[PDB]
Amino acid sequence: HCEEHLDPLSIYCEQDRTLVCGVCASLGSHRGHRLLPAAEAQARLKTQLPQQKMQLQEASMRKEKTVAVLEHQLVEVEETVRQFRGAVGEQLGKMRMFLAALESSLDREAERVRGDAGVALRRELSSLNSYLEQLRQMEKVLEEVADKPQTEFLMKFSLVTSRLQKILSESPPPARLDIQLPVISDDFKFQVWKHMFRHLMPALEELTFDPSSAHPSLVVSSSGRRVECSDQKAPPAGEDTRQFDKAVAVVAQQLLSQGEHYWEVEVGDKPRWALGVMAADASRRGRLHAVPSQGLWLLGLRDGKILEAHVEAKEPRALRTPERPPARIGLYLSFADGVLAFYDASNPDVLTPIFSFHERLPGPVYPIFDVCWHDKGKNAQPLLLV
Amino acid sequence: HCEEHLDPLSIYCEQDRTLVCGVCASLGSHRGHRLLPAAEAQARLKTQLPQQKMQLQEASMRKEKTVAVLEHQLVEVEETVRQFRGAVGEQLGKMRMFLAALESSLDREAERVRGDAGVALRRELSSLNSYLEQLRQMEKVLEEVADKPQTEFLMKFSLVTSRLQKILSESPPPARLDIQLPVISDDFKFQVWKHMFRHLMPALEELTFDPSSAHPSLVVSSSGRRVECSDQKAPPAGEDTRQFDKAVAVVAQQLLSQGEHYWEVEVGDKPRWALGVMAADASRRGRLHAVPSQGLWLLGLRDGKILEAHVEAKEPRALRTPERPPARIGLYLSFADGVLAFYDASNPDVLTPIFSFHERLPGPVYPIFDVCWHDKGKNAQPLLLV
Ligand SMILES: [Zn+2]
Ligand SMILES: [Zn+2]
Ligand SMILES: [Zn+2]
Ligand SMILES: [Zn+2]
């Protein structure tokens, strides 16, 4: 039953795995092959069956493994798309909400201005309208009684004279102040955009200084909000990893480890200071090396107008100092983006950036504040936690 | 009818303007006054009447003029409130529109990603499911055939072996499918805010150069969008104040006189160039003085990386050159705020400021572009009007 050479099917090619006839084995598909008979070939395959069953089941198992992983991936793709869309909506609705609130506030402004102006104008209008009624009566009665008996004539004339005299010699309205309603012209959109940044910042990280960590020559007041140096000698710090010994500074009690945070520090006219974050595991001993590899991310100002960033280098990098020694610094921290950014927050409405590090933070960090050395009393400025 | 002394009323008090009887005029409230009789008093007042009526008319005229002025003031206050509300609505709807458009674009992108991922995953699932059906058929036939004729048994066993071999060597990826799905981060708000500025700008002032004013050593192409110098000589400039003759430059055909405008100029790697505005009354002849007092507001770049602002002084002011030579400059102009602002538009999506003039402009001005000289063919870069 060869169906190709018309012989019974008796020869089995091993290296071809096909049952054949004699002609294809003599001069055909199997001229130089390893041949076997059909009987012992069948007897071999009846024993080879379990291996084939095992291999079939294993192949099905692998393909099913891939099916399961891919369907789980389909569910994961759906869920990730949902999360992306929802978070985009949330973080754009934040700014849209800011816009709606500002427009509502401006509507309040305009309505209040209109109401007060209308109140004052209608007050004067009522006064003048009563006045006009008075005067119309004056003219009518004078004309109508300029023919009456002498007694009536003189009485009415005297009354008219008195009424006209007083209403002419009446005191004007007292002194009000206008509510001008300042008008917006072109830069209003730009200023709204500038103002939106402060609201883009997260809720203020309400921090307090940790006197349990401060230098012994420092003093903390205002319930953890004020740190300053002193013009007097102090006992040396007790043996502790949680206390500075040479560089006068202090960390906050709160440990930042997740999410995003923002805090402002008031520095005023301080000639030298330093601000930033510090790795919690870092060592607070000796004169410090200001490099991020040692757990120190610091922005400094020296000599009153020299603003320095303590970058990974041999000497801290200088920065383009603003037109003033900044009076308030703002610090933004994010782990999901690994950034600590510095801002000149002297303007409560606009923040201008100063510097920002770019390193996936090992975490966690303590807010660190370097109120600089005594300098013989020429650096008595404090640090104020806003 | 004195009703207080019960006498007829006959005496008129001059300094009091009141009719009285004889007793109160003799020794009473009007005892030492200048008195007159009722007859001559009436004869005087009947002739004084027209003057009093005239004075009444004058007072009425004053009060009615004031009433009219106050009603006009009320109406003007109403209209001013309307205008204020409308302008606030317009300039906030700009940003709301940007937000909505960005959110819709991101939603479209995310939906495209989800659809493509679903298509690919269902493709792989169909492939693997057809494979599993094949393998179930393999197992079925293997279980059913272990007694059949030599031809049937060996034929089907060889076919099963071949099919399993082929589907094993045509194996799809055993792993999961790459998706690179969009993630939402903390910096999304900051990036949207940075992007919002370019859309806060007005619609691009699509400008065309004015060949009627350019230097004869210049050439305008690309339908008014491209201006270049030439590496070959040209005829001397024709007699016109409205044509540059010595300083190679060109103004736009459009005249800016009111409102706000914004236009971008692509400069690429051009080493020296200048951009800005020029007063229409200014003279475009001879060697020019680059000072706003002579109607020229210009920012220039020389030596490829030296960015200077041609401010009102004896020497051009230096500027903070960026870490790159800017590839596109943006110019914003406003009259109601008197500002000409320059931006590094090398990124057309985010703008970093470069300089800004601050003068309520005398007006009006033509956008002027100083495409610098050939420099012996080493300054052949063009100026491209976006
Ligand atoms: Zn063979
Ligand atoms: Zn054959
Ligand atoms: Zn009397
Ligand atoms: Zn009297």
Residue numbers in the entry:
A (entry chain B), B (entry chain A): 85 to 470
Published text:
Tripartite motif-containing protein (TRIM)72 (mitsugumin 53; MG53) has been determined to rapidly nucleate vesicles at the site of membrane damage, but the underlying molecular mechanisms remain poorly understood. Here we present the structure of Mus musculus TRIM72, a complete model of a TRIM E3 ubiquitin ligase. TRIM72 is a member of the class IV TRIM proteins, which is the largest subtype among the 11 groups of TRIM proteins. Its domain organization includes an RBCC domain followed by a PRY motif associated with a SPRY domain identified in splA kinase and ryanodine receptors (PRYSPRY) domain.
The coiled-coil domains (CCDs) form the main scaffold of an antiparallel dimer with a length of approximately 17 nm. In the middle of the CCDs, the structural core consists of the hendecad repeated region of the H1:H1′ helices (prime indicates the second protomer of the dimer) and the H3:H3′ helices followed by a pair of PRYSPRY domains. Between the H1:H1′ helices and PRYSPRY domains, the H3:H3′ helices are sandwiched to interact with both domains. Owing to these interdomain interactions, two PRYSPRY domains are located on the opposite side of the CCDs across the H3:H3′ helices. Recent cryo-electron microscopy (EM) analysis of TRIM72 and the crystal structure of TRIM72 ΔRING also revealed that the CCD ends are dynamic. These results suggest that the flexibility of long TRIM CCDs is suitable for recognizing curved cellular structures, such as phospholipid membranes and viral capsids, and filamentous structures, such as dsRNA and DNA.
